[PDB]
Structures are given as structure tokens and as C-alpha cells.
Design a protein around this motif. Structure first.
Motif, short mmCIF file in Angstrom:
data_model
loop_
_atom_site.label_atom_id
_atom_site.label_comp_id
_atom_site.label_asym_id
_atom_site.label_seq_id
_atom_site.Cartn_x
_atom_site.Cartn_y
_atom_site.Cartn_z
N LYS A 9 0.97 -1.09 0.27
CA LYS A 9 0.04 0.22 -0.17
C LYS A 9 0.81 0.94 -0.06
N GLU A 10 2.21 1.12 0.82
CA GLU A 10 2.98 2.27 0.63
C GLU A 10 3.63 2.36 -0.39
N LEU A 11 3.98 0.82 -1.06
CA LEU A 11 4.80 1.56 -2.15
C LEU A 11 4.24 1.90 -3.02
N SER A 12 3.23 1.96 -3.43
CA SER A 12 2.14 1.97 -4.26
C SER A 12 1.64 3.45 -3.91
N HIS A 13 1.34 4.38 -2.13
CA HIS A 13 1.45 5.33 -2.17
C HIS A 13 2.70 6.47 -3.21
N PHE A 14 4.06 5.65 -2.74
CA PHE A 14 4.66 6.61 -2.78
C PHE A 14 5.34 6.76 -4.29
N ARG A 15 4.83 5.59 -5.12
CA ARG A 15 4.60 5.34 -6.33
C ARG A 15 4.36 6.56 -6.83
N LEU A 16 2.59 6.68 -6.95
CA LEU A 16 2.06 7.79 -7.56
C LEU A 16 2.07 8.73 -6.60
N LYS A 17 2.34 9.51 -5.75
CA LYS A 17 3.14 10.63 -5.06
C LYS A 17 4.01 11.21 -6.29
N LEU A 18 5.39 10.01 -6.85
CA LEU A 18 6.45 10.59 -7.86
C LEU A 18 5.90 10.59 -8.93
N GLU A 19 5.27 9.84 -9.34
CA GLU A 19 4.17 10.27 -10.59
C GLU A 19 4.18 11.01 -11.14
N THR A 20 3.36 11.73 -10.47
CA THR A 20 2.34 12.78 -10.40
C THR A 20 3.50 14.35 -10.12
N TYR A 21 4.51 13.94 -9.12
CA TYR A 21 5.65 14.97 -9.46
C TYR A 21 5.85 15.52 -10.67
N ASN A 32 5.78 13.80 -13.72
CA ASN A 32 4.12 14.47 -14.67
C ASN A 32 4.34 16.03 -14.88
N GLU A 33 4.15 16.00 -13.23
CA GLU A 33 3.93 18.47 -13.62
C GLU A 33 5.82 19.26 -13.78
N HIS A 34 6.27 18.73 -13.13
CA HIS A 34 7.66 19.32 -12.65
C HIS A 34 8.96 18.98 -14.29
N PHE A 35 8.59 18.06 -14.23
CA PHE A 35 10.14 16.90 -14.74
C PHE A 35 9.36 15.71 -16.07
N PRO A 36 8.35 16.51 -16.60
CA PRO A 36 7.37 15.72 -17.55
C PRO A 36 9.00 15.05 -18.67
N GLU A 37 9.52 15.62 -18.66
CA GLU A 37 10.78 14.58 -19.31
C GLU A 37 11.74 13.36 -19.02
N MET A 38 11.28 13.56 -17.24
CA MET A 38 11.52 12.48 -16.70
C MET A 38 11.01 11.52 -16.92
N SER A 39 8.86 11.93 -16.49
CA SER A 39 8.21 10.85 -16.05
C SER A 39 7.71 10.30 -17.11
N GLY A 40 8.69 9.42 -17.72
CA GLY A 40 7.88 8.47 -18.61
C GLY A 40 9.55 7.01 -17.72
N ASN A 41 10.09 7.87 -17.21
CA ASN A 41 11.94 7.01 -17.07
C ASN A 41 11.49 5.93 -16.07
N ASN A 42 10.90 4.22 -16.37
CA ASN A 42 10.29 3.92 -15.04
C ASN A 42 11.37 3.23 -14.12
N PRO A 43 13.22 3.02 -14.69
CA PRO A 43 14.26 2.79 -14.17
C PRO A 43 14.37 3.72 -12.40
N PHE A 44 14.33 5.06 -12.33
CA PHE A 44 14.71 5.83 -11.95
C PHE A 44 12.88 5.57 -11.17
#
Length: 149
Positions: free
Chosen positions: A6-18, A20-32
Motif C-alpha cells: 500500500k505504501e509503495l503504491s502511495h509513494f510511486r503515485l506521488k512521484l509519478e504525479t510530481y 508529470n508536473e515538474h519533470f515531464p521529460e523524466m516522467s516516463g523513466n520507469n527505472p528511476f
């Protein structure tokens, strides 16, 4: 371990959103995203194990999640374009041009002179960066070399 999923999914979602908004160029980087979400989880699980409360653990895990991602070149270009070029390049142009400018050699060569740490925007050197970026975009427009579409 349910908590950990549950926590892992929460942190993943927060980072994906962040991103997507602020580093769209990095937002598809699955390894990171995978690796950074995993790190935040470890910080959370460590904190709980050591006696911190759930909110404390989540707070410090979030600082881990966002570490070194406080300064955004994308956001800086968008702001320069909105504050300084509102008459010549009104919305939605800032959001459309910023990613292209981020790939422009003139613009990159400016950002590369600075140490873009998390506290950079509070830095004396922020104003220098901002002015230098404004001047570069003026030159790009005056020389008719602004990237298009």
C-alpha cells in the motif's frame, strides 16, 4: 507487507504525479521511478522499525522521494515565459515551448553553468540564471531562431 504494498503504491503515485508536473521529460523513466519509490519505502519501513510514527515515517520517506528534484528547469522556463514573454508568447505557449527550449543548445549551455541544487532557487545565483534565460529567449526571438510548433 500489505502495508508495504500500500505504501509503495502511495509513494510511486506521488512521484509519478510530481514528475508529470515538474519533470515531464523524466516522467516516463520507469527505472528511476521504480528505484526511487523503492528507496522511499525503505526509508518508511526503517523509520517505523526505529520507533517513528506512521505520519513521521511518511513525511521523511517523502523527503527521500523528492530529494534532488526540488529545482526544475522545466518550471523555470515556464515561469520565465509567463512572467517575461506574456505579450509575445501567451498561454498555452509557455507549456508547449518549455520542453523544446529544454532541448535547445543555447538554453542548455546557460543552465549548465549553475549548480542546480534543491536550495538553488533561494540562492543568490537564481536571479542570475533567470536574467540570463530571459536574455537568451530575447535573442532567440530577435534572431528568428525560436524553436517552433
Amino acid at each position: 507487507k500489505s502495508t508495504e504494498k500500500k505504501e509503495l503504491s502511495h509513494f510511486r503515485l506521488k512521484l509519478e504525479t510530481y514528475l508529470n508536473e515538474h519533470f515531464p521529460e523524466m516522467s516516463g523513466n520507469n527505472p528511476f521511478i521504480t528505484a526511487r519509490s523503492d528507496e522511499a519505502l525503505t526509508a518508511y519501513c526503517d523509520a517505523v522499525a526505529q520507533g517513528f510514527s506512521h505520519p513521521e515515517a511518511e513525511s521523511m520517506a517523502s523527503e527521500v522521494l523528492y530529494q534532488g528534484l526540488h529545482f526544475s528547469r522545466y518550471d523555470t522556463l515556464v515561469s520565465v515565459l509567463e512572467r517575461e514573454f506574456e505579450q509575445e508568447l501567451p498561454s498555452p505557449l509557455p507549456e508547449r515551448l518549455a520542453p523544446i527550449l529544454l532541448k535547445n543548445k543555447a538554453i542548455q549551455s546557460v543552465f549548465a553553468k549553475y549548480d542546480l541544487t534543491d536550495d538553488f532557487e533561494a540562492s543568490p545565483e537564481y536571479e542570475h540564471l533567470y536574467t540570463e534565460l530571459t536574455g537568451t529567449i530575447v535573442l532567440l526571438i530577435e534572431s528568428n531562431h525560436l524553436p517552433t510548433i
